[PDB]
Amino acid sequence: MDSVPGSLVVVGGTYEPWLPVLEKVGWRCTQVADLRKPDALFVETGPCIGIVDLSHDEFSLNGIANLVSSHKQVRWLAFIREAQLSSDTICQFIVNFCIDFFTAPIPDAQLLSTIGHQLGMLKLEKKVWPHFGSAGNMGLIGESMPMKRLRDQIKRIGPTDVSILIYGESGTGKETVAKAIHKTSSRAQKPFISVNCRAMSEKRLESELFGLGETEEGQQPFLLQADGGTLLLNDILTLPKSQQLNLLRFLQEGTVETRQGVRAVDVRILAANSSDIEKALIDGDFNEELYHYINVLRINVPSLKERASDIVLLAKHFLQEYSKEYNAQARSFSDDAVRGLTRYHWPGNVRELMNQIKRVVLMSDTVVLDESQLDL
Amino acid sequence: DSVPGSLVVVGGTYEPWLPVLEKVGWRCTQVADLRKPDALFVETGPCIGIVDLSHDEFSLNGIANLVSSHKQVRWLAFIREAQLSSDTICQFIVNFCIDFFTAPIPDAQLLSTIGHQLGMLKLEKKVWPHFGSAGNMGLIGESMPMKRLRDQIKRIGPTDVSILIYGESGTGKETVAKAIHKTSSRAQKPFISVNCRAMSEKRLESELFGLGETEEGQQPFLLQADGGTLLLNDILTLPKSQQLNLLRFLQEGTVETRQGVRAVDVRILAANSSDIEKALIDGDFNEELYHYINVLRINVPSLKERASDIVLLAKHFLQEYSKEYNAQARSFSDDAVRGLTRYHWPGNVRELMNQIKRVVLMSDTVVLDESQLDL
Numbered sequence A: 001m002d003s004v005p006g007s008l009v010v011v012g013g014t015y016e017p018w019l020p021v022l023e024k025v026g027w028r029c030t031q032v033a034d035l036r037k038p039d040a041l042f043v044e045t046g047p048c049i050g051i052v053d054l055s056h057d058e059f060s061l062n063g064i065a066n067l068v069s070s071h072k073q074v075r076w077l078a079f080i081r082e083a084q085l086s087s088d089t090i091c092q093f094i095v096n097f098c099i100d101f102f103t104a105p106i107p108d109a110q111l112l113s114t115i116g117h118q119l120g121m122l123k124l125e126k127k128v129w130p131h132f133g134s135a136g137n138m139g140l141i142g143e144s145m146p147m148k149r150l151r152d153q154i155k156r157i158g159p160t161d162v163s164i165l166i167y168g169e170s171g172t173g174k175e176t177v178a179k180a181i182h183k184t185s186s187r188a189q190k191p192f193i194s195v196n197c198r199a200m201s202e203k204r205l206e207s208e209l210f211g212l213g214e215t216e217e218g219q220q221p222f223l224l225q226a227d228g229g230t231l232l233l234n235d236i237l238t239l240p241k242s243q244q245l246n247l248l249r250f251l252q253e254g255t256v257e258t259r260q261g262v263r264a265v266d267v268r269i270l271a272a273n274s275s276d277i278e279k280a281l282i283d284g285d286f287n288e289e290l291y292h293y294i295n296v297l298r299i300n301v302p303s304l305k306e307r308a309s310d311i312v313l314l315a316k317h318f319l320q321e322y323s324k325e326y327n328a329q330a331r332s333f334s335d336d337a338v339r340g341l342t343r344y345h346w347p348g349n350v351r352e353l354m355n356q357i358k359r360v361v362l363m364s365d366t367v368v369l370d371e372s373q374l375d376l
Numbered sequence B: 001d002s003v004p005g006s007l008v009v010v011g012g013t014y015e016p017w018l019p020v021l022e023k024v025g026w027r028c029t030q031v032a033d034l035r036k037p038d039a040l041f042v043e044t045g046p047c048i049g050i051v052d053l054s055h056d057e058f059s060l061n062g063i064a065n066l067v068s069s070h071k072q073v074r075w076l077a078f079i080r081e082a083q084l085s086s087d088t089i090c091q092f093i094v095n096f097c098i099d100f101f102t103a104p105i106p107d108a109q110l111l112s113t114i115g116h117q118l119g120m121l122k123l124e125k126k127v128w129p130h131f132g133s134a135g136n137m138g139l140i141g142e143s144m145p146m147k148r149l150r151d152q153i154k155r156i157g158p159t160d161v162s163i164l165i166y167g168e169s170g171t172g173k174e175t176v177a178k179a180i181h182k183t184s185s186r187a188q189k190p191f192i193s194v195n196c197r198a199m200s201e202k203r204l205e206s207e208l209f210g211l212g213e214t215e216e217g218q219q220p221f222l223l224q225a226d227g228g229t230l231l232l233n234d235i236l237t238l239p240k241s242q243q244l245n246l247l248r249f250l251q252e253g254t255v256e257t258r259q260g261v262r263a264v265d266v267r268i269l270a271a272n273s274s275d276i277e278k279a280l281i282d283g284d285f286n287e288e289l290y291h292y293i294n295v296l297r298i299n300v301p302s303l304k305e306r307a308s309d310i311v312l313l314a315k316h317f318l319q320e321y322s323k324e325y326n327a328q329a330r331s332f333s334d335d336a337v338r339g340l341t342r343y344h345w346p347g348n349v350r351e352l353m354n355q356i357k358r359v360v361l362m363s364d365t366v367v368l369d370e371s372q373l374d375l
């Protein structure tokens, strides 16, 4: 009265031999013949077992590899059937995490042994899947097309727990993106701690990996508080060599120093950056070993220049937000302002946008804001 | 013949299942740090790896990183934990992890899961018993990041699937393309590099097969690469329309010929040097297309990283170029070597040949000094 689905892709539907030994033991085994079809089929079945009939048969090895990872990266669990082809390329093709294979004969009792191992995996996949989506909560800034690509990504790079380098132009949303992945992560209910490295002397930074005072003092390093959760370093290259070390050191031992004794913690480390990373690297101004520990995954937060259509939704949102907050009169932009609001280049991007609107709202006395009330 | 399978834990007291692997004759090696196994895993290449999380002593950031820190295919992942773990970070088995160890000791099932995976490690081990052995000249140089490159190339080469070749400018992407094509079962078959940067979209049109004012007798690169392997360097340079046709071909497996459309069989490699992520978000490169070629990736390290290769590379290029241009030069002074490595080398290995080519064509000595180089 309890089981899980496991489908297979093959031309010859006469390739029964392994279907009934799964059917009569209770499997929801589905079968696809095309290469177009099983792509559609898998996006819908979610977590399942997927057998690929290489055999002596068909399908482009590229197309299969594509399919295997397309977006079916784990809710797929790879399995492959073949006509005893232990020789050429085909064997190397099981680098594509195809965990196991089917010999030509039909080992009825032995078959379930290999396939069964994955059941615990498919069951916990169905268990960790209800994270799903949630409209990304308005996408925390705006939502168009580079933003949709961003939104989609944040969802898929969130859960991993690996370090991510969040880079983009200055004042784009990098920190808000950090929070966005921290709440998508499996450590969302746990603390989040942004840190502005730029505005800290090398001695101030010291007070972050061991703290300061000779006594408890109520100090406690930033790493101690971020336990379980996620710490963020904005402008990460700004760090002094002495501190980059400690960052790396911590990234290996998973330990901080406290006045109440050295204690180990567990903090997912994210880094923000806006300056030329390569130039700092090649010159030897930023530890490369540190860079690699942090560049495990990358996310690019697009400048407003890229999401031009987003400005108007952003401006309107900021107006509605600031006006209703400051008792202000303004309720909308004149068509003049809008058609002018996109023409602006916006160096500081979303930051420069909110700040300038904050100024305009706090000053402008009309209900409709015109282009002349804006930039000047 | 071998059986490499390592596991990382401080507390070696998680024996219970170790002798059941040890006494049947398996090479179980064990690391305590998280720093040590990073070094250990980047060099050991393909193996089986058990991670003893338990309730014990590793940062989930540190572990997830390690599990993903470029050990992406070279390492078939495994994890051990106490009966009552779960709930919180089951997500760590998004990193495939193949399977995991319950607290009890299923003696026969233990070997069942591991042995089946050992057999999988055994199939790499089938074309593997060369074991390191430096490599087939490495078609440019030889240090240790390079050995790792060969290690990859060796194991991802034969797989007839597409590879995305990324590295800095002038690193070896094309020479690597050729190198993986020479590992492929289509090595004796054509190889076709394509400089996409220096081709307008209309020249690109006449290749898939496109149009052009024809009236023609042309055979597209895909038509010529039939059976063999086609390479596109600087793939990001492609206009969407071409990205489409590339994608289109990557789905249909067909080209157009002047005498009517015929289908071919071409392994597609792509080289890249620009920030691929930024290009993706902005919408400058078709994402479904990206997935067809980013099925596997290979990273060619800049000279900056492999400094010890500079001296070995420089010597080879002097050696070849001098013998070609009747030149006098035979070696570099110690002055030159310790100065030749100090350079940052943006253009890397190509920039290395060119500057040396320049010096040879100029210098009249047999020994080149540091003052004869950069100047």
Ligand SMILES: Nc1nc2c(ncn2[C@@H]2O[C@H](COP(=O)(O)OP(=O)(O)OP(=O)(O)O)[C@@H](O)[C@H]2O)c(=O)[nH]1
Residues within 6 Å of the ligand: A169, A170, A171, A172, A173, A174, A175, A176, A193, A194, A234, A272, A350, A351, A354
């Ligand atoms: N909830 C929370 N907000 C913070 C924290 N630290 C800074 N902030 C706020 O985060 C805001 C930044 O949001 P934005 O106005 O969108 O600027 P931004 O584009 O995200 O800035 P960048 O990430 O550098 O590109 C600032 O007003 C900060 O005051 C923090 O620790 N917790």
Ligand SMILES: Nc1nc2c(ncn2[C@@H]2O[C@H](COP(=O)(O)OP(=O)(O)OP(=O)(O)O)[C@@H](O)[C@H]2O)c(=O)[nH]1
Residues within 6 Å of the ligand: B168, B169, B170, B171, B172, B173, B174, B175, B176, B233, B271, B349, B350, B353
């Ligand atoms: N030794 C050798 N070199 C070749 C051959 N065919 C082409 N080459 C050159 O060797 C170069 C490849 O090595 P590199 O000098 O590192 O150039 P590259 O790194 O591939 O250039 P990028 O891909 O843009 O980074 C090509 O640019 C070719 O100009 C060959 O048959 N033998």
